[PDB]
Copies of this chain bind each other. A is one copy, B any other.
Amino acid sequence: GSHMASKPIEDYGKGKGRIEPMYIPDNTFYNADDFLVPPHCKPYIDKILLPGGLVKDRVEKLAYDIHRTYFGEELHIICILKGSRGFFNLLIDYLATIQKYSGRESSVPPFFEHYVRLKSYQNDNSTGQLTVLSDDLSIFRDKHVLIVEDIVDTGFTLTEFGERLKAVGPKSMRIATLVEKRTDRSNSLKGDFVGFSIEDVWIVGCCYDFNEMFRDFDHVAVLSDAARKKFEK
């Protein structure tokens, strides 16, 4: 163990000491027509915010940042379902590979995986209620916990779930989020390992859904008017 892994519980969600994310300036997009877009997505995707390959490149760096923080530590990593599935899978592949090739050796696994299903949204609006599905959280007492999320927008999801975790007394709590949105709807909760800062637009693709649609598309796009009209409920 190293003091590098420590973090006060009161610092949860404050982003203290973080490396700032890649900042995608307002109105910065690629054209969907430059990518292969499958037939079920073609009528609906016009603007690409984050190419899928750019996501993977950035997650490599996040994974190294995490590796450096937790080397040799027992690390309990929590996937927030459904949305973080893709980011989590990329992350844990990199974490395992980095450790496998590291000259410095650890007798501890690179992580221990866990799953929690949270749900807030219908269309692009929160219901105001958080659904929480988890194993008994008491297993996280005195553990170093890393929550893995796809996006932080208002902060409601991770503020609420964070209080449930604090109640069992973890040793440390950090957040990895692929995206953080720039919005006056945010309650100021922010991640520790953040891929990208983006403008206030509703993203779809690469696990980002609109009523369960678009998760399998390879790229992070914006929700178009055609997509909203077809898939809203």
Contacts and interface: CB of A to CB of B under 8 A. Distances in A.
Interface string A88-115: 0100100011111111111111111111
Contacts of A34: 21-22, 58, 61
What 3 pairs across the A-B complex have the smallest Cβ distances?
A: A53-B53, A101-B101, A39-B105
B109 A135 contact: no
Contact of A53 (B55, B106, B133): B55
Given A117-B135, A216-B92, A60 B40 contact: no
Nearest to A131: B135
B36 A61 contact: yes
A58 B97 CA distance: 15
A112 to B, nearest CB: 6
Interface in A32-71: 34-36, 38-40, 51-58, 60-61, 64
Number of copies: 4
A141 interface: no
Interface string A10-33: 000000000001100000001100
A168 interface: no
A233 to B, nearest CB: 13
A182 interface: no
B51 A216 contact: no
A218 B31 CA distance: 23
A216 B115 contact: no
Interface string A110-125: 1111110101000000
A101 B64 CA distance: 8
Given A34-B61, A89-B89, A107 B215 contact: no
22 contacts: A22-B30, A34-B58, A36-B60, A36-B64, A38-B99, A39-B107, A40-B106, A40-B108, A40-B109, A52-B53, A54-B54, A85-B113, A92-B216, A97-B97, A98-B101, A100-B101, A101-B101, A103-B103, A103-B104, A109-B213, A117-B135, A133-B134
Contacts of A117: 115, 133, 135
